[PDB]
C-alpha cells in the first residue's frame, strides 16, 4: 500500500524519510542542487494547516526512489522545517499552474 500517494506516485514512509534527510542536510550546509535551487523556502501560498512550525523548505521526492541530484525535479515535494520535522508531502499533479495540493 502507499503511505503517501501523489497522483500516480506511491511513496512509503522510508521514501519520505530518505528524501527529507537529503534535503535537510543540504539545507544545513547552505548548498543547492539543480536549476531550481533545492532545497528552497516553501511559502505556503496554499495556506495548508501544517502541524509543525514554519519556516518551511521544499525538496523534490522522486517516483524512481532515487535521491534528487539535478535535472527534472518532477512534480512531487517533501516539505520540512528547521527542526527537521516533516510538514507534509505535496504535488503540482492535479493542481492548476504551479499551485500544489497535498498527497493523500
Ligand atoms: N505554488 C507554490 N509554489 C512555491 C511556494 N514556495 C515556493 N514555491 C515555488 O515557486 C514557484 C512559483 O510559485 C513554484 O513553482 C515553486 O517551485 P517548485 O516548482 O520548484 O517546487 C508556495 O507556497 N506555493
Ligand atoms: Ca519507494
JSON list of C-alpha atoms in Angstrom, two decimals, residues 33-98:
[
{"chain": "A", "resi": 33, "resn": "UNK", "atom": "CA", "xyz": [21.08, 21.45, -6.27]},
{"chain": "A", "resi": 34, "resn": "UNK", "atom": "CA", "xyz": [19.54, 21.76, -9.71]},
{"chain": "A", "resi": 35, "resn": "UNK", "atom": "CA", "xyz": [18.42, 24.66, -11.83]},
{"chain": "A", "resi": 36, "resn": "UNK", "atom": "CA", "xyz": [15.58, 25.49, -9.46]},
{"chain": "A", "resi": 37, "resn": "UNK", "atom": "CA", "xyz": [17.91, 25.63, -6.42]},
{"chain": "A", "resi": 38, "resn": "UNK", "atom": "CA", "xyz": [16.57, 22.97, -3.99]},
{"chain": "A", "resi": 39, "resn": "UNK", "atom": "CA", "xyz": [16.05, 22.94, -1.08]},
{"chain": "A", "resi": 40, "resn": "UNK", "atom": "CA", "xyz": [14.26, 26.29, -1.04]},
{"chain": "A", "resi": 41, "resn": "UNK", "atom": "CA", "xyz": [11.82, 28.12, 1.22]},
{"chain": "A", "resi": 42, "resn": "UNK", "atom": "CA", "xyz": [8.25, 26.90, 0.87]},
{"chain": "A", "resi": 43, "resn": "UNK", "atom": "CA", "xyz": [5.92, 29.94, 1.33]},
{"chain": "A", "resi": 44, "resn": "UNK", "atom": "CA", "xyz": [2.53, 28.25, 1.98]},
{"chain": "A", "resi": 45, "resn": "UNK", "atom": "CA", "xyz": [0.65, 30.27, -0.58]},
{"chain": "A", "resi": 46, "resn": "UNK", "atom": "CA", "xyz": [-1.87, 27.44, -0.42]},
{"chain": "A", "resi": 47, "resn": "UNK", "atom": "CA", "xyz": [-2.47, 28.00, 3.26]},
{"chain": "A", "resi": 48, "resn": "UNK", "atom": "CA", "xyz": [-2.31, 24.33, 4.26]},
{"chain": "A", "resi": 49, "resn": "UNK", "atom": "CA", "xyz": [-2.67, 23.73, 8.05]},
{"chain": "A", "resi": 50, "resn": "UNK", "atom": "CA", "xyz": [0.64, 22.08, 8.81]},
{"chain": "A", "resi": 51, "resn": "UNK", "atom": "CA", "xyz": [1.03, 20.61, 12.27]},
{"chain": "A", "resi": 52, "resn": "UNK", "atom": "CA", "xyz": [4.68, 21.72, 12.53]},
{"chain": "A", "resi": 53, "resn": "UNK", "atom": "CA", "xyz": [6.03, 25.28, 12.73]},
{"chain": "A", "resi": 54, "resn": "UNK", "atom": "CA", "xyz": [7.32, 27.40, 9.91]},
{"chain": "A", "resi": 55, "resn": "UNK", "atom": "CA", "xyz": [9.66, 28.27, 8.19]},
{"chain": "A", "resi": 56, "resn": "UNK", "atom": "CA", "xyz": [9.26, 25.50, 5.63]},
{"chain": "A", "resi": 57, "resn": "UNK", "atom": "CA", "xyz": [11.61, 24.18, 2.91]},
{"chain": "A", "resi": 58, "resn": "UNK", "atom": "CA", "xyz": [10.70, 22.04, -0.11]},
{"chain": "A", "resi": 59, "resn": "UNK", "atom": "CA", "xyz": [12.87, 19.37, -1.71]},
{"chain": "A", "resi": 60, "resn": "UNK", "atom": "CA", "xyz": [11.81, 17.00, -4.50]},
{"chain": "A", "resi": 61, "resn": "UNK", "atom": "CA", "xyz": [10.89, 13.35, -3.85]},
{"chain": "A", "resi": 62, "resn": "UNK", "atom": "CA", "xyz": [11.28, 11.22, -6.98]},
{"chain": "A", "resi": 63, "resn": "UNK", "atom": "CA", "xyz": [8.99, 8.38, -8.13]},
{"chain": "A", "resi": 64, "resn": "UNK", "atom": "CA", "xyz": [12.07, 6.25, -9.01]},
{"chain": "A", "resi": 65, "resn": "UNK", "atom": "CA", "xyz": [13.16, 6.22, -5.40]},
{"chain": "A", "resi": 66, "resn": "UNK", "atom": "CA", "xyz": [16.43, 7.89, -6.39]},
{"chain": "A", "resi": 67, "resn": "UNK", "atom": "CA", "xyz": [17.63, 10.90, -4.43]},
{"chain": "A", "resi": 68, "resn": "UNK", "atom": "CA", "xyz": [17.33, 14.15, -6.46]},
{"chain": "A", "resi": 69, "resn": "UNK", "atom": "CA", "xyz": [20.64, 15.34, -7.80]},
{"chain": "A", "resi": 70, "resn": "UNK", "atom": "CA", "xyz": [19.74, 17.54, -10.78]},
{"chain": "A", "resi": 71, "resn": "UNK", "atom": "CA", "xyz": [17.67, 17.72, -13.89]},
{"chain": "A", "resi": 72, "resn": "UNK", "atom": "CA", "xyz": [13.94, 17.25, -13.74]},
{"chain": "A", "resi": 73, "resn": "UNK", "atom": "CA", "xyz": [12.59, 17.54, -10.20]},
{"chain": "A", "resi": 74, "resn": "UNK", "atom": "CA", "xyz": [9.26, 16.00, -11.16]},
{"chain": "A", "resi": 75, "resn": "UNK", "atom": "CA", "xyz": [6.04, 17.25, -9.51]},
{"chain": "A", "resi": 76, "resn": "UNK", "atom": "CA", "xyz": [6.43, 15.94, -6.01]},
{"chain": "A", "resi": 77, "resn": "UNK", "atom": "CA", "xyz": [7.92, 17.69, -2.98]},
{"chain": "A", "resi": 78, "resn": "UNK", "atom": "CA", "xyz": [8.67, 16.83, 0.65]},
{"chain": "A", "resi": 79, "resn": "UNK", "atom": "CA", "xyz": [8.11, 19.88, 2.97]},
{"chain": "A", "resi": 80, "resn": "UNK", "atom": "CA", "xyz": [10.24, 20.07, 6.23]},
{"chain": "A", "resi": 81, "resn": "UNK", "atom": "CA", "xyz": [11.10, 22.73, 8.82]},
{"chain": "A", "resi": 82, "resn": "UNK", "atom": "CA", "xyz": [14.05, 23.98, 10.79]},
{"chain": "A", "resi": 83, "resn": "UNK", "atom": "CA", "xyz": [13.82, 21.16, 13.29]},
{"chain": "A", "resi": 84, "resn": "UNK", "atom": "CA", "xyz": [13.73, 18.53, 10.52]},
{"chain": "A", "resi": 85, "resn": "UNK", "atom": "CA", "xyz": [10.11, 17.75, 11.22]},
{"chain": "A", "resi": 86, "resn": "UNK", "atom": "CA", "xyz": [8.11, 16.51, 8.26]},
{"chain": "A", "resi": 87, "resn": "UNK", "atom": "CA", "xyz": [5.32, 19.04, 7.48]},
{"chain": "A", "resi": 88, "resn": "UNK", "atom": "CA", "xyz": [3.82, 17.26, 4.51]},
{"chain": "A", "resi": 89, "resn": "UNK", "atom": "CA", "xyz": [4.19, 15.72, 1.00]},
{"chain": "A", "resi": 90, "resn": "UNK", "atom": "CA", "xyz": [2.70, 17.89, -1.75]},
{"chain": "A", "resi": 91, "resn": "UNK", "atom": "CA", "xyz": [2.41, 17.87, -5.53]},
{"chain": "A", "resi": 92, "resn": "UNK", "atom": "CA", "xyz": [1.78, 20.00, -8.58]},
{"chain": "A", "resi": 93, "resn": "UNK", "atom": "CA", "xyz": [-0.07, 16.97, -10.10]},
{"chain": "A", "resi": 94, "resn": "UNK", "atom": "CA", "xyz": [-3.87, 17.75, -10.22]},
{"chain": "A", "resi": 95, "resn": "UNK", "atom": "CA", "xyz": [-3.16, 21.34, -9.21]},
{"chain": "A", "resi": 96, "resn": "UNK", "atom": "CA", "xyz": [-3.60, 24.24, -11.67]},
{"chain": "A", "resi": 97, "resn": "UNK", "atom": "CA", "xyz": [-0.44, 26.01, -12.83]},
{"chain": "A", "resi": 98, "resn": "UNK", "atom": "CA", "xyz": [2.37, 25.93, -10.25]}
]
